[model samples]
Target: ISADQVNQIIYNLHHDPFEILGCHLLEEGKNTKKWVVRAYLPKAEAAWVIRPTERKEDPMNSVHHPNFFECIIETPELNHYQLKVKEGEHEKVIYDPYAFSSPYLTDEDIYLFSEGNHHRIYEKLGAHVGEINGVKGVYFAVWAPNARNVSVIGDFNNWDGREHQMRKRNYTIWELFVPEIGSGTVYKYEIKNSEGHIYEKSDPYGFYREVRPNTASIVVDIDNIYQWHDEEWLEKRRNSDPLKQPVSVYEVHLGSWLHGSSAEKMPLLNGEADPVIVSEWNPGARFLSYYELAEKLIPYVKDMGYTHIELLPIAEHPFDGSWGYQVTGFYSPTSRFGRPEDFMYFVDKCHENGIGVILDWVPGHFPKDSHGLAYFDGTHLYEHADPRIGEHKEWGTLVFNYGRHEVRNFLVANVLFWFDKYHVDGIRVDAVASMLYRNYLRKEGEWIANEYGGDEHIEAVSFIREVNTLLFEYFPGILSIAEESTEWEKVSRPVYDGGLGFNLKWDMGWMHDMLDYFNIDPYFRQYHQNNVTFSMAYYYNENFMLALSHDEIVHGKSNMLGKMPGDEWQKYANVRALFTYMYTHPGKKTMFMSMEFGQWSEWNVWGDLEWHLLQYEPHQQLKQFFTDLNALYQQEPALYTHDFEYHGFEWIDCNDNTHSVVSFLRRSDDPNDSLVVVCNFTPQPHSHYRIGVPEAGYYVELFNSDAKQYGGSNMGNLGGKWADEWSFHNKPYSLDLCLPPLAVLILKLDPTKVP
Candidate 1:
């Protein structure tokens, strides 16, 4: 080798050390070759090459650099070799990683990755455990098209980047088979940009990660660590459609170890532009592991009768406060709770216990952590050049550039990876409204419009449709839900119908309007009566899931019970009534953690939720109300069968602003199983209140939020009431019912007693 080559290897300037540090041949006289092998040992005192097949141990000596070892030998064909080196007082044998002829990844994989069509490119790019020609080790690959040099650095080589240089398979992918590296090896990619600035970046496709404060990737055999036992669950999910079935999702953010009442803010991370939230916990309380959640959380959801569990982004994030919204490791499950296999165990247990698992995916924006995608490869690689299009000024995060094929590929493959590797049932896209409009959270003259001079982000729209299309095509029964807040048209329609396709969109309007109406004083709620009835006007515009979610319970918004504008007694009653309204309404259902039992404070990231609240009778009452509410929602086909159909709901009296009461009818295909719902949104009971019905018969009271057992006044019908054969509120029959105070009542028709 040349003197400069030796110096570059010694100085760690050449990331592709395979060019000068491995075996090479020199031509000699008489059609012979003088083979030379090179080794770069940073602190080795002496070294030798052991050619197993040739049965030779050749001594290595310095040629031009002391740290650079070389040996010259002309011998028989070598099949395998080892490196024996002495560092200080001990000797070790390592399988030479560069002895075998370097092979490239499949051309088809490279092409599909560049084209953004490789759905399984995750397996090809990340660190994977595989055998190469009878040699077992981990295969490391990364995509960094703009980096000048890239090397794998970890504790194995004492964090030296020059110890193992990766070969550039293509312009975008760098790869190397690292022998002697086993599972649980923590590593990072040390990349040098064009200007020779080095940055140690975590692997974008790492399946498992180090804990918080340590931004390194861990090598694990994700394939064989835990055997999955969710076959029947997956088969059932594939066969059944979520929209047509009961889908009550119990939303959870696992960071809050299921212990605290107040949120504590942590100091801002270095170079992190935004202040972060990391809640404090009680003394001696600990974070629960995924295995613990699998044991504790699943049974609670199952007993509560929810069909699915929606976790708020279990992916890797440094700050617990962002709740995975400001995520870094897209492919990795955050190691805060446990490893990737631990998360798999959680999902597997969820499915086995009859719960679908949904992961909240944040494709709208990512935190600007310096170790993350910010200025990756020293360029705006995954984001836009202009801050107007690429930054979320309100959120203090960076928006994704969906216009780029590889960036889109990175996102698309991640959604599939969750389903493929972790076996998740669905994905809820958070902050989708931010991706829909270019001027989102921006003032006039502060942002640039699209090419057509429209407010819509067309590239983001197309990316959303492509992801939804591919998602349904791959996992037909899985959900592609959206946290879209605007009245953007046809968000749940198919792409061919000229719409952004999502299986279900969060009913943000209903959530906001419900809270608004309930927050008003009951005495003068007449002026704002539309708040309770306005969502039904546009309810059918998209497939919706009415969610009282984590967003509503954080950031000074107060807990679900705290939103009620009333005394403690009234607060308990009002929340129970509100949940009754939401459960019986036309849509799927979702409730965040601590929402079921009326948590007094807002959600905290690092602290556990106050499970002790259940000791209070009022909290216990709300918990019972929530559990029964979920059971009734799942058992009654009238509530979920045709949630998107217009004929499923018929308003009996929406213009009851004077009484602050509204009655509606929920129906299935069969009229016999229809439900009549009445709501009294005031503290005073409405005596002799008349409500319309479909047919003249006894309406058996199926559920009453005002029942004494649910911490409400014992005001209800005597089991049922007979409807008179007289017209009222545009219906054929009416019943003179005494409405409960601040309550909702559901009555099913007694078909045999129709008279």
Candidate 2:
């Protein structure tokens, strides 16, 4: 063979080391073919070619490179051999990684992957602990089309690329199966690009990863571990429709949930219903383990009566400050808490406790971490090459090249992977507005329009449509929510209807309007009364989830309580009124962690929630109001059943701008199931106010935001009010009610209370 090829092997720069380093046929002898075997073991003192089924061995001579070895053998085509290697005083027989020539990935798998339709591509393209022909080891595969050479390097191979050169199955893919290595092995792909540059990358589809500050992928047999016990939940979930059902999401950041300590585990986790102070807490304590969080968060959410617990992204990321938004590993669960199985357990516990889990998934862009997918294979493989279309200057990240099949496959399969493996109930796609437009947050000169002169990122739109289409088709009852901020039409409509194909979209318009309205003083509430009324004009256009998310409570925007413009007691009453409106509004709900208790300080990832503040009366009362609000919401079908339909909500007296009051009714498919909501925004209590009612009956005070126990003024009707036949506000009947100051009242018809 060529001496230059052998020299390439010595230097770890050979594109096809199998051509020179593996056993090859020289020429046919009279009886059988003569064979030549070669290897490059740079640290080895000597080596031998040893057959497995037969007792035969031959010494390998040191060749052109001092560490390179070769041997000759006369054997039939059916026979093959392993390498018996030596490193001075130690000797071990190992399977040569390059010996096998069989294909691990089926031809169809490669074709579908290249076509971007491999729905479960995660099964083939990552490090999987498996057995081939009774030999157990980890099989690894990655796509690096422009790479000249790719090798699997890890602790098992002494971090040497020459020892485990992968097979370049096609022009685009590389694969290798190392025999005898089990799970929990740390590894990375060592690639030599076309520019003769070397790059080490973590597997894009790895199931587990080493903790942050350590960017190695861990080979874990995740499928075998963590036997799930949520079969009943899955079956029930499959038969249900999440949009029609009650969906109140409690958004949480797992890392700072407790900033947990060893002493607080059992006491704070399994304590009484009354909120207790964490006697000892720190700003720099480590996170609670996944198993630990299951016991705590599941019970907490259950007690709070939220139907779903939506976690901030739990995927592996290098930096904590990014809050998992700038992701590195798409398939691997972050190692910040625990292993993949541990995260699996957390989700399992949520389902077991009847709480659906939703994870915030960031697919818009990624940070250019050295070992991540950025500049992978020394090319813009996963991201776009041009900064105009591929860079997010605001966040210092690279946008994905959704136009490419392999890149689309990476994200589309990632969408399916979490649901298929982790059994999460929903994927809340983060920063979707950033992905749907080309000119987002960019100056005019810095951007380019499409051929049609449209601002839409059509490729990303297609990817999203395909992903959500498949997601709902495969997993019924699971939510595919988009956090698209703009007034993108029909974002939650079906793809066949010329829509974005998401089942739910965040109601950013409603969130912003309500927050801005709430931030204004009550003295000027009349001038901006339309701020609260503007949402209904387009509420039916898309399925909406009213989110008082983490964004509203962080980065100097102020906490839910801090947003109110009033005294200490008045601010809390305003918050109560705000929450009352959110619950009674015609949309699903999402509340960030401390927003429920009216956390006074803006959220900081470094510290835990202000749980100790609950020891004081105002915070304690607000916490109770939050809890009761959730209970009332879940208990009434009228509030949730037909949220997206026009029949569910009807205005009673929306024109009372001078009085700063609003009234509405929520109903189920059966109009008989109805709840009347009347809100007063000003601090002026009305002893008697006439409002419309559909039926003639006694209206029992079902829920009052101004109740004394909820830190309110307690100005309200004592028991009930009987409706009068005199038509008011254009209704068939009227009810004269006590309208509380800066509060809301939920009234329901109770036949027994009629007098």
Candidate 3:
């Protein structure tokens, strides 16, 4: 090789090393050709070329560069050769990674990826462990169309970006076959952008990533590691209808839901020398592993009668304070719990216990961490170019440019990745309102309008429809729930009907109004009675889920129980009545952790929940009430069957604002299975109060919030009240009953007796 080629190879500036480093034919004086082989072994003491069939070893001489070796041999265009190297008497044979000429990616793949139509783009763009021409190595590829050059750097190469430069293809993808670099190798892409500034980035499609404080992607054989045991669950999920089924979700933040004592420590999954110290967030707190959570968290949810356990974003994130909302690894399961397989084991256990799992997915924005997708490829490839349309100033994050085809593809495939690989039953998409409107959280003149000169984000609306369409097509019966707060039309309707196509939407209006009503003093609740009953006017507008979620319990917002405007005893009583209304309301349900037990403290991400609160009688009683409430909700067909149908509910006396009391009837398709829900918002008991009933029969007292079992004063009708033929409130029958103080009563009609 000439001095110029040698200098280029030594300085790691050679874009196509195959031409100079691999075997090539050289022309000689006598009209003959000779085979010249070149290899660069920076750490080798000696090197030789071996032809296995011939059992020959040809010693190579050190050439112009100390590490560059070359040898010329007279042979008919050789094939199947191996390089043997020695380092202080230890020698091993290795295949020359550059010797193979087979293309790892097909032309169609390149075209589809460029067009953003590749549904399985994740398979082609990340560090995949594969064999090329029977030689095993990691096939590393990345999409950086604007990059000048890209290289793979990791522990194998001493973190030097120059050691293995990737080849540019189609002016978009950079790929390289790295031999001997197998699973467990920590790696990152070193990109030389068009401006000549180099930055290290984690793989956007990495299936496994290093723990926080170390942002490298791990090479893993994700396809072969764990055998799933949730086939039956998957089949059942595919055949299920989420809207008609009972969906009581127990939302949990894995880090703070439960934890081990501070003295425990575990090494990183890749066997890194230093285990992540728990003190980074809390001095003596330990996050439970995924396996441990499977053992404890699942059983508790199942026992509490929840149909699903919605985890607060389990994707890899850097900051513990973010609670996983600021995701860095979109495809990777966070290593905080364990390996990817450990999370698989957790999902398997959840399915085996008959509990569905839902992951909170954030597609609206991403944190501007340097090692993340921010400024990736030295450009706004994933985000918008303009700050008005690209940044979420309130969150201090960058907004995704949904108009970009590849960006949409990246996000849509991420949703499918979790469902296909992790076996999650659904996804609760976070902050959807932010994506639906360009002017979200922005003041006048601070936002951009669409082509129609409106605030609507048309491209984002299209992206949402596309993702929801793909999700149902690929994984039938999987839920796509939106945490949308606005009155955007038809959020949960199908895309074919000119809607956003989410399976369910959070009822933020109902939550806010209900909380506001509960926070008011009981005496003044009469003037604001419409706040409690106004939701029924629009209850069927969308598929809704009533959520007393983490958002209501953080950042100076008090706990659910603490929000009660009453004394200690009345506080517990108000919360008990509030949950009664929530469960009996016409919608599905999801409540954050610790809300079940009336946790008095605001949720703290730095440590475990106030689990010790269970020691008190009020807390224990409130938990039992919640547990039984979930059971009652799941068992009664009237509570869930027609949640979205107006015919399912009838007001017995919604105008009872004078007594701060309202009574209603919930009915199933079968008239015999129905319930009478009566709530007394004030502490004043009403004697000889009469409420209407749809049928003339004994209404058995199914549940009483004021029962002594729930730490109440035990004020209720004895057993039940038999409905007489006397008509009241425009009903065929009525019952004279005594209403308890600040309580809710659920009375189920006698199913044995015909209506």
What TM-score does prediction 3 earn?
0.85
Which residues of candidate 1, in runs, are more than 4 Å off? 1-104, 257-283, 753-755
Candidate 2 wrong stretches, greater than 4 Å: 1-103, 262-284
> TM-scores of the models, in the given order?
0.83, 0.84, 0.85
Quantify all predictions' global Cα lDDT against the true fold: 0.82, 0.85, 0.85
Worst 10 residues of 3 by lDDT: 267-276
How well does candidate 1 match the true structure in TM-score terms?
A: 0.83
Q: How do all the candidates rank in terms of TM-score, highest first?
A: 3, 2, 1
Tens digits of per-residue lDDT, candidate 2, 261-282, equal 4334322222312212222345
Q: The CA-based lDDT of model 1 is what?
A: 0.82
**lDDT ranking from best to worst?**
2, 3, 1
